[PDB]
Short mmCIF file of C-alpha atoms in Angstrom, two decimals:
data_model
loop_
_atom_site.label_atom_id
_atom_site.label_comp_id
_atom_site.label_asym_id
_atom_site.label_seq_id
_atom_site.Cartn_x
_atom_site.Cartn_y
_atom_site.Cartn_z
CA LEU A 1 0.00 0.00 0.00
CA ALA A 2 1.03 3.63 -0.37
CA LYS A 3 2.94 5.07 2.59
CA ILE A 4 2.13 8.63 3.59
CA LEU A 5 3.99 10.87 6.04
CA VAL A 6 1.75 13.48 7.68
CA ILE A 7 3.15 16.50 9.53
CA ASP A 8 1.05 18.67 11.86
CA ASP A 9 1.74 20.08 15.33
CA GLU A 10 -1.85 19.49 16.44
CA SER A 11 -2.22 15.95 17.81
CA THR A 12 -5.97 15.74 17.29
CA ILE A 13 -5.66 16.95 13.69
CA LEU A 14 -2.83 14.52 13.09
CA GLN A 15 -5.04 11.77 14.52
CA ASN A 16 -8.07 12.70 12.42
CA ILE A 17 -6.05 12.83 9.21
CA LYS A 18 -4.32 9.52 9.98
CA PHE A 19 -7.69 7.86 10.56
CA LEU A 20 -9.08 9.21 7.29
CA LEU A 21 -5.99 8.14 5.34
CA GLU A 22 -5.98 4.62 6.80
CA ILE A 23 -9.65 4.28 5.87
CA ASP A 24 -8.64 5.49 2.40
CA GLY A 25 -6.23 2.56 2.12
CA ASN A 26 -2.88 4.13 3.09
CA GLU A 27 -0.16 3.19 5.56
CA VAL A 28 0.44 6.36 7.61
CA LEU A 29 3.45 7.79 9.46
CA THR A 30 2.94 10.90 11.59
CA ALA A 31 5.12 13.69 12.96
CA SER A 32 4.09 16.42 15.41
CA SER A 33 7.08 18.67 14.69
CA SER A 34 9.01 19.77 11.59
CA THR A 35 12.26 18.21 12.78
CA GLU A 36 10.60 14.91 13.65
CA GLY A 37 8.96 15.05 10.23
CA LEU A 38 12.20 15.59 8.35
CA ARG A 39 13.87 12.95 10.53
CA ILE A 40 11.30 10.25 9.81
CA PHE A 41 11.36 11.30 6.16
CA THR A 42 15.13 11.01 5.90
CA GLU A 43 15.02 7.54 7.46
CA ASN A 44 12.31 6.40 5.01
CA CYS A 45 12.90 8.59 1.96
CA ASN A 46 12.95 5.47 -0.22
CA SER A 47 9.65 3.96 0.93
CA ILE A 48 7.50 7.08 1.44
CA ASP A 49 5.23 7.90 -1.50
CA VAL A 50 3.69 11.19 -0.39
CA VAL A 51 4.36 13.81 2.27
CA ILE A 52 1.54 15.98 3.57
CA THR A 53 2.36 18.95 5.78
CA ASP A 54 0.55 21.99 7.10
CA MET A 55 1.90 25.24 5.64
CA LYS A 56 2.44 26.58 9.13
CA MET A 57 4.60 24.74 11.62
CA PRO A 58 6.74 26.04 14.48
CA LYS A 59 10.43 26.69 13.72
CA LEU A 60 10.35 25.32 10.16
CA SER A 61 7.35 26.14 7.97
CA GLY A 62 5.87 24.01 5.22
CA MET A 63 8.02 26.04 2.85
CA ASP A 64 11.20 25.11 4.73
CA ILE A 65 10.05 21.49 4.99
CA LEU A 66 9.30 21.42 1.26
CA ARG A 67 12.72 22.82 0.34
CA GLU A 68 14.55 20.27 2.47
CA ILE A 69 12.59 17.33 1.07
CA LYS A 70 13.33 18.41 -2.51
CA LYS A 71 17.07 18.44 -1.81
CA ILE A 72 16.92 14.85 -0.55
CA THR A 73 14.32 13.42 -2.95
CA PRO A 74 13.90 15.78 -5.96
CA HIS A 75 10.81 13.95 -7.24
CA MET A 76 9.00 13.33 -3.95
CA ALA A 77 5.38 14.48 -3.96
CA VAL A 78 4.73 17.06 -1.25
CA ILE A 79 1.19 18.25 -0.56
CA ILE A 80 0.69 21.32 1.63
CA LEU A 81 -2.50 22.08 3.56
CA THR A 82 -3.03 25.85 3.63
CA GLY A 83 -5.14 28.25 5.65
CA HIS A 84 -5.52 32.00 6.16
CA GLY A 85 -2.71 34.15 4.79
CA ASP A 86 -0.85 31.20 3.23
CA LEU A 87 -2.03 31.83 -0.33
CA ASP A 88 1.09 33.71 -1.44
CA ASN A 89 3.39 31.04 0.00
CA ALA A 90 1.22 28.28 -1.47
CA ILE A 91 1.68 29.70 -4.97
CA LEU A 92 5.41 30.08 -4.34
CA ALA A 93 5.54 26.47 -3.13
CA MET A 94 4.07 25.29 -6.43
CA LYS A 95 6.90 27.13 -8.16
CA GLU A 96 9.26 25.55 -5.62
CA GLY A 97 8.33 22.01 -6.61
CA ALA A 98 5.37 21.24 -4.34
CA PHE A 99 2.93 18.73 -5.87
CA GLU A 100 -0.25 20.48 -4.80
CA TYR A 101 -1.70 22.61 -2.02
CA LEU A 102 -5.15 22.08 -0.55
CA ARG A 103 -7.03 24.96 1.03
CA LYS A 104 -8.72 24.27 4.36
CA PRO A 105 -11.09 22.88 5.19
CA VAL A 106 -9.81 19.92 3.17
CA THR A 107 -12.21 17.11 2.32
CA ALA A 108 -11.54 13.38 2.29
CA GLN A 109 -12.20 13.51 -1.46
CA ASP A 110 -9.68 16.34 -1.99
CA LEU A 111 -7.01 14.36 -0.17
CA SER A 112 -7.74 11.00 -1.79
CA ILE A 113 -7.65 12.55 -5.28
CA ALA A 114 -4.40 14.42 -4.65
CA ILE A 115 -2.77 11.31 -3.18
CA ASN A 116 -3.90 9.17 -6.11
CA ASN A 117 -2.46 11.68 -8.58
CA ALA A 118 0.81 11.80 -6.62
CA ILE A 119 1.10 8.00 -6.71
CA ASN A 120 0.38 7.96 -10.46
CA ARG A 121 3.18 10.47 -11.01
CA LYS A 122 5.59 8.32 -9.00
CA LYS A 123 4.69 5.31 -11.13
CA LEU A 124 5.29 7.28 -14.33
CA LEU A 125 8.79 8.02 -13.04
CA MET A 126 9.74 4.41 -12.23
#
């Protein structure tokens, strides 16, 4: 099954998203901090298929997280969940190599579609 890494500093949100993604048929790894996220990613950069992160995180933002992932795995699909005031950065992220950004509130359908498209892209690159 696809393996997804989800990064959010809000435990309950992280839990809700994990639940939804498991129901959607994904294996899910979670990180409650940007450093933990990049750590887990580095240790599994060859088995992770998609990374989902909130645009805003303490210390390192989704932008910083995105940039670091791209340096390690240039073709890794990174999806950013965006809220108020993140629009400008979201657009920049797309120019920075992000796969897609989803404006909150994000629906289960939005996420499942984006993940499916990310997996298809990975397969095209094999």
